[PDB]
Amino acid sequence: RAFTVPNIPLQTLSNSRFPSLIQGMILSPDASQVVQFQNGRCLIDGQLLGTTPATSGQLFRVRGKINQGARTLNLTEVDGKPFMAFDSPAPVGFPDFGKCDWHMRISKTPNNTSSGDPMRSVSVQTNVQGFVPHLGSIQFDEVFNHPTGDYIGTIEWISQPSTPPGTDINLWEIPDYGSSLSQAANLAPPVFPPGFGEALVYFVSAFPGPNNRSAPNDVPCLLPQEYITHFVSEQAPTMGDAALLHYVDPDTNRNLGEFKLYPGGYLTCVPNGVGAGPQQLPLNGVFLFVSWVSRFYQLKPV
């Protein structure tokens, strides 16, 4: 099967770390930034990595059992199937927002009642001893004095981590999935800056909550979720060092810039000096697969 990417404008595509439209395309503020996101990780032949779901339905949800009077949510997969501990960093689609406090909204499922607000607020710190999703559990800040059951929900807003005091949100990082006696197994590996004039491209969407900068919380990811779904369905074999893409204005068919899509599931470009980069481009463009290229192909600066 021949390789393709979805024929949909970037601004209509979705973040792969949480369900939301993509609102920007950027380089990392630190040129040396290494990332290790667990969601939005997919080899371009359709192999999912880390905790990455095939589709948005599973993305950025948390599900588990909790007993009345406990602080611990014992995780399952989003569809209620058992989570196999020690195997993966966390259930598929589990949030990968590091360096922040999570303020979640959850509810008991299925409904078995004729009245009542089912929504419960809980908070999760990700750098504490009780945050051990790789062992199958996370700990809420407070005792959960609500009925025992199967709860499902998501993070509604984030704030600065409670500890160390004063530290800011840093969404370039992932939480500590592991425990005191065990590192998390099968983490999607780190992605390093490519060098040779190339730079990683990140797709960003704003997420609710405060921070020390009194500005939006911007969530960077490596691939639009629709690209992931496409690759999972298509399973097109990787036949070059990189897939050369053109970012095309669909109104005019003008090529706005060359990008490389690497087998590992990330995009690069060559910024044309400081100030230049993909953030200068309109967001109504569509990426188009042009050709497989070798390791010796040099991108035209953007």
Ligand X SMILES: CC(=O)N[C@H]1[C@H](Oc2ccc([N+](=O)[O-])cc2)O[C@H](CO)[C@@H](O)[C@@H]1O[C@@H]1O[C@H](CO)[C@H](O)[C@H](O)[C@H]1O[C@@H]1O[C@@H](C)[C@@H](O)[C@@H](O)[C@@H]1O
Ordered DSSP codes for 62-109 = EEEEE-TTEEEEEEB-TTSPBP-TTTSSSSTT-----SSEEEEEEEES
Residue 101, contacted partner among ligand X, Na ion, a second copy, none, CB below 5-8 A by kind: ligand X
> In the range 207-236, which residues lie near a second copy by CB under 8 A?
208-217, 225-226, 229-230, 232-235
Residue 112 is a binding residue for ligand X (CB under 6 A): no
Restricting to residues 147-166, name those near ligand X by CB under 6 A: 159-160, 162, 165
55 binds, among a second copy, Na ion, ligand X, none (CB under 5 to 8 A by kind): a second copy
- Written as six digits, the tokens of 190 are 């780190």
* Residue 181 neighbours by CB under 8 Å, 6+ apart: none
Residue 120 near residue 170, CB atoms below 8 Å = no
| 131 touching Na ion, by CB under 5 A | yes
Q: Output 110 or 275, the one with its CB closest to ligand X.
A: 110
Cis peptide before 194 (omega within 30 of 0): no
Residues 6+ apart with CB under 8 A from 23: 11, 204, 205, 206, 283
Q: Give the contacts of 165 (CB within 8 A, at least 6 positions apart).
A: none
Q: Distances from the Cα of 194 to the Cαs of 3, 36, 252, 294, in angstroms?
A: 23, 15, 32, 15
162 interacts with a second copy by CB under 8 A: no
Interface with a second copy includes 12 (CB under 8 A)?
yes
Provide the minimum distance between the beta carbon of 182 and Na ion in the complex, in angstroms, as a whole number. 10
Q: Which of residues 89-118 bind a second copy (CB under 8 A)?
A: 103, 105, 107, 109-118
Query: Where along the sequence are the contacts to a second copy (CB under 8 A)?
Result: 6-8, 11-15, 19-23, 53-58, 78-79, 103, 105, 107, 109-119, 156-157, 159-160, 206, 208-217, 225-226, 229-230, 232-235
Query: Where along the sequence are the contacts to Na ion (CB under 5 A)?
Result: 131, 176
Query: Where along the sequence are the contacts to ligand X (CB under 6 A)?
Result: 101, 103, 115-117, 123, 159-160, 162, 165
